[PDB]
Each structure stands twice: as C-alpha cells, then as structure tokens.
Amino acid sequence: KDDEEADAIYAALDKRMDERRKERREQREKEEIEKYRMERPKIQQQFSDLKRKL
Amino acid sequence: AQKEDMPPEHVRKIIRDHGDMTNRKFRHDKRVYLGALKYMPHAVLKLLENMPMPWEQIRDVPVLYHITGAISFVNEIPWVIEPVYISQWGS
Amino acid sequence: WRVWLFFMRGITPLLERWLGNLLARQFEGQRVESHFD
Amino acid sequence: QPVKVRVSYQKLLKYYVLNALKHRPPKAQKKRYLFRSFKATKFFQSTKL
Amino acid sequence: SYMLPHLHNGWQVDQAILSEEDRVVVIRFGHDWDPTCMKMDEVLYSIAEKVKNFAVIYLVDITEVPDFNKMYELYDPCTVMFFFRNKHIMIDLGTGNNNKINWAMEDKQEMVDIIETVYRGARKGRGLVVSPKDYSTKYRY
Amino acid sequence: KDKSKELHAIKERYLRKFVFEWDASEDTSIDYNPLYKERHQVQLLGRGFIAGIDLKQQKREQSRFYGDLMEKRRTLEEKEQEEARLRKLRKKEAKQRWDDRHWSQKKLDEMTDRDWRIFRED
RNA sequence: AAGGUAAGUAU
RNA sequence: ACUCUGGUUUCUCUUCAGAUCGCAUAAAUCUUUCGCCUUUUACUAAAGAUUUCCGUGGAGAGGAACAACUCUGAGUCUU
C-alpha cells in the first residue's frame, strides 16, 4: 500500500500551493454571492411564504 | 535534522537506472513516479531562466531532483545586479 | 529569451492542470434561456 | 530606416503601452513557496549540477 | 429530469439495456443538476410519451453510477446513448463522435427523428445510422 | 503634391493565414508637415550618442556644427591638449585595427589561433 | 487539435 | 574620556501587503462591444471584473552558521 500514501502527498502539496489566496478568494466570492442575492433572491425563498401556507 | 546536498553522482546513477519501460526492475512505483510529472513546465521554466550567459563557460546550479529521476528543477532564481548585468551585456 | 520566459510563466498553469488531471487515477471532464423556466 | 523596423517600433511601443495601462497591483497572498514544499516531503533530493 | 425513470446502479442499467427487445433504450448519462442535462432531460420528457411505442428513456447519474465512465467515455456534462437488443448503436451525427450525443438539443422534433432513425437502422440490423440532420454546424445565422 | 496633403488632412479632420510580418499599412510615422518629417535629431552637445548604434559611424554622421564651434572658440593652448588627445586615441585605435585585421593582411607564419580558425571557418 | 470511425457476421 | 549595550549571515514556517509588492510583465475564465464567422477547441482587439502563475516587501515565529567580542547610542564622558 505504497501508492495510496503517495497520492495524498501530492494532493496535500496541491492544497498547500492553493492555500496562497484560498481564504482571500473564498471570502470575496461570499460577499459577491450576498450582494447578488440582495437584488435577485433565490427562487425557493421567493415561494417561502406560499410554501409555509400549504 | 536537515537534508544535505547529495553528491552529483547520485542523480546520474538514478537516471541511468531509469532506462525505459521495457526494463522489468521498476514496474510498481507508478503513483510516486508519475504523480510529479505534472510539474514538468516548471522544469521547463526553471532551467530556461537559469540559462548561462555568453560570458560563462560552465554554470553550476542547485538542482532539486525527484528521488526516482522523474523530474529535476533548477532550484535557483537568476538574481543579478542590474548595473553589472547591463554592463556585461554592453561588453 | 525573456519574452519566451514571460510566455512560460503564463502557460505553465495550463499545462500543469491539463497534465495533472490527465495522468491521474481519476479523470475529470444555449443554457441561458432554458434556465429560469 | 526602412518601413518594417519602424512598424516594429510602433508595435513594441503598443505592447509596452498596453502592459503599462492594463496593469493592476499584485494581490495579497500568504507566500507559499514551491521547491520548498517538495524537499519537505521525502520525494526530492538537493544537489548541484 | 425528475419525471423520467432513474437507474441507480450499473446492474440496473445492464438489465434496462437487456430487458427491451423491440424498443431502443435511450439512456442519458449525466447529472440532474447539470444545466445541459436539464435541457436534454426536459426535451426527453417532452417526447417521452410520443416515442413510447419504439423507445424507452432512462436517466443514469454518472456520479452515482460511475460504472460506465471508463468504457463509454462519459466525461462530457451530458450524454445521450442508444442501445438496441443489447447493442450500442452509433449515429453519424457529423460531430466526429458517432458513439453518443454529448450536447443538449433544443428542438423536440430532432430528437424524435434521431430515435426513429436509430430504431429503423437497428431493426434492419445496422450498427451505424446516419442522422437526418448533420450536426457539424449549429446552423446559426 | 504635399500642398494638397495639408488640405486633404484639414478636410478629413473637419468633413487560415498566419502573418509573422507586420503590414506596412500599419505604419503611423507618415506625415505631410516638413517639420514632422525631417525632425531635428538631438545633437547632445556633440558628445552624446544614440544607444546600440556604433560610435565610429555616429561620429561621421554628426552635423559638424559643434565641431566647428569648438575649433572656432578654442584658443591655441587648449587646442593643443585636444589635438594631443585626438592623436593618442587615433594611435590606440590604429593599433587595435592593426591587431584586428583580416587574414589577407597577415602572413601564414604570423597567423594567430583566432585568425587561423577564422581562415578555416571561411 | 478536430468537425474524415462503413456496419455486419466468424474464430 | 569612561562601563553596559549582544550582533550578522543563512535555512524554513505562519501571516499581512497599502506600495511601480514587480523601475519587469504572462496566461486563463466570465461579462459586454467588435473583426472572422462554420462547429466546438483555438482566435481578431479593445473594455470591465475575476482566477492562476513567475517573482516581491514588512512583521512574527523556529533551527543553523556564531563565536562574540563588541559596533552603537544611552551617561556625567575623565584630565
């Protein structure tokens, strides 16, 4: 089982290289999603009151 | 501890050992071997930027080489003093 | 030499991601109007 | 000077101007270094060649 | 998408292809959430009843059923494949890939024509059928 | 011709294949104004030279205005120092040209290794 | 780089 | 004219980056405007927003070379 312990090394290496801006880009996309949903709400939330009334 | 610099003959012996796919001595070390081949462009980029200049016969560079001979990077950035570099290229 | 190195820095991610997703064990792969309905 | 070298001059200036115009300040990052995490793992060795 | 029958494992896909002896089995490999797959599945649902006599339509989730990803190259976002009497049928679509339809088709008549051509050719014994429409160009003007 | 170029400019203002080469039509350095065509190149006080271009050729393309100004304003005493410097530099460059000459001006016995390989490479 | 795979029986 | 003052180099890690991070300069995706248009994968070239990549500075931390004396200012600094 010397292969499944070697794929993890390269996978962790790739994750470490992605760690440069992972927090700084997954946070900006969060604010973009919130801003987009402020103007255009989700479809399920547009029927939340009606779904409640069922 | 810390990893020391291996003698230059180690990489030569490893590469001569890694002849071809026909040889049956190495057939199971695949994930360790070809998992690092995706970084081949860096090996392309690292040596081309460390190209010896016209005023140098031999340019020894530090090398970070895979333990299986799969890949070798020139682990060095060509840092130069800009007036010295410009004067050398003017010469 | 420097021009092709500047090309190289940009093209390295493409080749790296194309390779690493190719010789890996697991491979990975008009909708605007037919969306909201 | 001939026409082709002149056009070379304007095109080099064009690329220089485009680079200097469409330039954004580099984005903040956590400084993860490659060739430093290779040798951390037991898969790469260092030498001089 | 959520109306057509769903196959949940490779054995179910095997049995679905094996079970039908006089109808072409149309299988959509993909994901319910994929927009291309939603367009393809809504077209299939539109024509599901009309082709009842000579076609049966099933939906297979490749993430849930990755059993045929390697052999059938099910790596495009959407894939439509036709089988007849346990035999994959190829279509000369003009796209360069005769083994599958790997895009969403808008018109519901074109899919009916493709299924009808596949049924005719397969009942005649052919393994390749030339589609009535050449898909080397989207005919956008 | 050029007179109508100005009027044409005034009127215009108011009223598959890989191409490695750059088309000559893309050239912008085309002007009707004699001022903007034959521009006055920077003399740099007769002591500065454009980069890349060799200094020896640049010296003989000089306008000679500053050379005449120097030979006019200079007194005899300060003229002798410049004459001596010019003679010394001329002698040094003559020695350099004598050492760096073609093999046609050298005998076989006095050939150097560099000249030998130059002759062989011909 | 492609949109240029005849299909079918038989081992 | 005095006692204490504690280095520099280098290898890594963790973060923050306003600033020409960079006196240098690529690529990708998306959104618009175009030019080819014949279908993606490549493109024509401007704009906008992003991502990745080649590099960078500051700070903090952890080892090593360093071996430490002293640089150095603090001062009663002395005739």
Side-chain angles (χ1 to χ4, degrees):
Chain A
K1 274 179 277 193
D2 50 357
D3 290 332
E4 63 169 59
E5 58 88 20
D7 284 315
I9 294 183
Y10 292 113
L13 165 72
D14 295 343
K15 177 60 76 75
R16 158 162 186 83
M17 280 315 127
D18 208 44
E19 278 171 5
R20 301 194 194 172
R21 297 194 69 254
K22 208 260 197 177
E23 290 214 316
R24 318 195 189 223
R25 76 159 147 73
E26 87 178 4
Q27 181 66 28
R28 175 203 41 82
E29 79 190 8
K30 187 158 299 308
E31 325 290 347
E32 294 294 328
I33 278 167
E34 298 256 14
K35 183 266 290 180
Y36 183 61
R37 286 326 189 196
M38 277 216 287
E39 280 56 70
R40 193 257 182 193
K42 264 203 275 200
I43 292 182
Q44 204 209 24
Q45 269 76 16
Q46 281 165 345
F47 311 133
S48 57
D49 50 356
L50 276 297
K51 186 206 206 304
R52 154 178 305 110
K53 297 317 274 286
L54 296 192
Chain B
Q2 207 186 17
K3 296 280 276 285
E4 301 106 1
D5 271 347
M6 315 304 324
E9 276 82 7
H10 203 263
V11 55
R12 298 174 199 150
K13 187 181 190 290
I14 279 182
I15 281 173
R16 287 203 258 95
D17 277 352
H18 182 74
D20 283 327
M21 182 179 72
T22 312
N23 191 20
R24 296 190 77 110
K25 194 136 79 180
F26 41 99
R27 266 150 59 237
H28 315 314
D29 55 344
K30 296 287 99 177
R31 287 295 109 201
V32 61
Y33 167 79
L34 61 83
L37 292 178
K38 59 184 296 285
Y39 304 109
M40 181 75 38
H42 282 88
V44 165
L45 166 67
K46 286 314 280 202
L47 69 87
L48 281 185
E49 73 174 0
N50 289 271
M51 211 195 268
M53 299 286 138
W55 56 82
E56 303 164 355
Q57 291 98 18
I58 297 169
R59 183 154 154 154
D60 270 28
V61 295
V63 192
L64 182 61
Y65 72 94
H66 200 286
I67 209 174
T68 59
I71 202 159
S72 301
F73 314 100
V74 179
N75 191 16
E76 201 202 30
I77 305 179
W79 294 112
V80 297
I81 298 171
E82 51 266 60
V84 178
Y85 185 88
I86 292 159
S87 296
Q88 279 162 330
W89 266 112
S91 65
Chain C
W1 166 65
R2 62 185 308 253
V3 160
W4 290 114
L5 286 171
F6 301 144
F7 161 76
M8 192 56 58
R9 65 181 293 275
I11 195 65
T12 293
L14 261 63
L15 270 52
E16 283 215 341
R17 68 179 81 139
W18 176 82
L19 283 162
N21 292 331
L22 194 54
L23 73 164
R25 185 79 72 91
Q26 278 90 15
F27 186 83
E28 315 194 11
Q30 69 188 8
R31 52 192 197 87
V32 185
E33 84 273 355
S34 292
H35 171 125
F36 191 83
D37 48 347
Chain D
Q1 279 209 341
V3 190
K4 65 185 181 77
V5 300
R6 278 180 320 192
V7 180
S8 177
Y9 270 61
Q10 290 90 21
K11 286 309 182 150
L12 284 165
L13 266 189
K14 176 165 177 302
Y15 290 152
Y16 157 59
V17 168
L18 276 171
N19 260 335
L21 182 58
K22 297 276 293 298
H23 163 259
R24 303 276 80 84
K27 295 297 175 175
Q29 79 196 21
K30 281 173 184 178
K31 270 163 63 179
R32 299 281 177 272
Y33 284 108
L34 208 58
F35 303 152
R36 287 194 200 187
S37 51
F38 289 166
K39 62 189 291 292
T41 70
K42 66 181 179 66
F43 279 167
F44 288 82
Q45 302 300 311
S46 306
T47 174
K48 208 168 293 290
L49 298 167
Chain E
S1 180
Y2 43 100
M3 291 275 148
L4 303 167
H6 271 264
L7 305 176
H8 300 288
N9 51 51
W11 181 80
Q12 275 160 19
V13 191
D14 271 6
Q15 286 319 294
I17 294 164
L18 275 173
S19 71
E20 279 303 306
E21 312 275 340
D22 66 330
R23 289 190 305 182
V24 59
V25 184
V26 189
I27 299 192
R28 195 270 299 143
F29 294 105
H31 297 90
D32 312 308
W33 41 268
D34 216 351
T36 314
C37 276
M38 294 183 286
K39 294 169 293 157
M40 172 52 67
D41 291 331
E42 66 89 17
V43 161
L44 285 187
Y45 159 81
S46 290
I47 71 158
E49 180 70 24
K50 302 168 57 184
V51 306
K52 182 175 174 66
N53 280 126
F54 60 95
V56 55
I57 294 168
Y58 292 117
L59 302 188
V60 171
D61 205 0
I62 46 177
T63 289
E64 166 181 40
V65 192
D67 294 78
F68 316 98
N69 291 23
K70 297 190 61 177
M71 51 155 88
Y72 286 166
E73 295 201 329
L74 307 170
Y75 295 120
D76 291 331
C78 186
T79 286
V80 188
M81 211 175 288
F82 306 93
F83 305 83
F84 198 95
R85 223 160 289 172
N86 181 18
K87 185 173 177 294
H88 166 242
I89 305 304
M90 299 169 25
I91 298 89
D92 208 308
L93 295 158
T95 63
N97 190 357
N98 295 354
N99 309 280
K100 64 171 68 65
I101 307 178
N102 48 20
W103 73 95
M105 271 165 308
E106 292 274 334
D107 212 310
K108 85 168 193 181
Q109 185 67 34
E110 315 210 307
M111 191 55 178
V112 169
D113 300 7
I114 289 178
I115 296 177
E116 191 255 1
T117 291
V118 165
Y119 179 84
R120 281 164 179 297
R123 213 180 180 62
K124 286 199 183 188
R126 273 185 257 293
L128 177 78
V129 293
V130 191
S131 62
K133 194 199 197 77
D134 189 19
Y135 293 93
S136 63
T137 292
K138 291 177 188 306
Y139 297 106
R140 303 187 323 210
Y141 280 136
Chain F
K1 159 187 172 62
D2 283 330
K3 290 168 298 314
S4 291
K5 298 298 293 295
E6 179 202 20
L7 268 65
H8 177 259
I10 299 170
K11 277 178 121 193
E12 281 305 319
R13 168 170 174 73
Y14 287 98
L15 304 176
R16 284 161 270 299
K17 300 281 191 189
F18 297 83
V19 295
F20 293 0
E21 298 288 331
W22 273 120
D23 206 51
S25 66
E26 310 256 3
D27 198 0
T28 304
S29 167
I30 60 171
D31 292 306
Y32 58 92
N33 214 351
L35 296 186
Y36 290 77
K37 263 200 286 194
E38 287 266 293
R39 285 181 182 175
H40 192 113
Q41 317 286 129
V42 298
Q43 314 264 20
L44 297 176
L45 283 180
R47 307 180 181 177
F49 310 106
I50 298 85
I53 304 175
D54 64 322
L55 317 166
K56 306 294 153 290
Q57 186 218 46
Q58 273 169 323
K59 282 171 189 173
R60 78 168 161 265
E61 315 287 340
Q62 274 213 55
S63 60
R64 187 59 60 231
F65 170 83
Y66 280 126
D68 301 322
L69 190 67
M70 296 301 102
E71 76 178 328
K72 189 174 60 52
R73 265 182 189 149
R74 272 174 183 152
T75 62
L76 204 62
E77 199 283 306
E78 62 203 47
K79 257 191 280 189
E80 312 306 334
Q81 283 142 220
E82 185 67 26
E83 266 283 349
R85 177 202 76 96
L86 284 168
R87 277 191 54 256
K88 189 72 174 181
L89 259 177
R90 177 72 217 87
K91 283 186 178 187
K92 273 200 296 293
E93 294 298 326
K95 287 184 300 174
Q96 209 181 101
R97 297 280 85 74
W98 179 85
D99 210 302
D100 290 332
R101 65 182 183 269
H102 201 59
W103 59 265
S104 62
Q105 279 149 27
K106 297 189 193 169
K107 273 77 70 178
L108 268 188
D109 292 333
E110 68 174 4
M111 292 305 208
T112 181
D113 52 271
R114 184 180 169 280
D115 202 3
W116 258 103
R117 66 172 181 76
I118 279 175
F119 185 33
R120 271 198 192 96
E121 185 266 329
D122 289 349

